[PDB]
Amino acid sequence: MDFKQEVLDVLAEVCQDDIVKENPDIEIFEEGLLDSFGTVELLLAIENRFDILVPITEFDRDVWNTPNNIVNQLSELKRSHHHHH
Ligand SMILES: *O=P([O])([O])O[C]C([C])([C])[C]([O])C(=O)[N][C][C]C(=O)[N][C][C][S]
Ligand SMILES: [Mg+2]
Ligand SMILES: [Mg+2]
């Protein structure tokens, strides 16, 4: 699957709302689609699905504020934050 699409798939599942696909510029936190619990769930799901570890200390609601921006952040971090054998 396309990386962006697979990320949006995970996000939609954690948010339990496909709106994150329909409008990838929706303000996730301003619209209450995700809370702190959901943020942890999301980061854990990302590591499980992609083996990309995003430390909670790196997450910023202002930077990871829309589906598009989350996809973009993960894209930037993918290489350096992937587990190493
Ligand atoms: O990290 P946040 O989402 O901003 O935390 C919000 C808090 C501070 C209000 C937090 O205590 C909280 O979410 N309480 C509700 C119970 C819960 O879900 N705790 C786990 C937070 S990841
Ligand atoms: Mg937080
Ligand atoms: Mg950090």
Domain locations in the chain? 1-85
CB–CB of 82/51 below 8 Å? yes
**CB of 16 sitting under 6 A from ligand 1:** no
Q: Return the CATH fold of 1-85.
A: 1.10.1200
Joined together, the tokens standing for residue 7 give: 């990320």
- The type of residue at 61 is R
Encoding tokens for residue 25?
């510029």
* Cross-strand bridge partners of residue 82: 52
Resolution expressed in Å: 1.8
Q: Which of 52, 42, 45 is nearest to 75 (CA)?
A: 52
User: For residue 77, which ligand has an atom nearest its CA?
Assistant: 3
Give the residue among 71, 77, 70, 84 at the shortest CA–CA distance from 54. Answer: 77
Ligand 3 mean position, distance from CA 63 (Å) = 14
C-alpha atoms less than 13 angstroms from C-alpha of 13 in its C-beta half-sphere: 13
Tokens 């973009």: give the residue. Answer: 72
- Measured between alpha carbons, how far is 42 from 45 in angstroms, rounded to an integer? 5
Ligand 1 pocket, residue 35 CB under 6 Å: yes
Q: Which two tokens stand for residue 60?
A: 């910023």
Cα gap 2→7, rounded to integer Å: 9
Q: CB–CB of 15/28 below 8 Å? A: yes
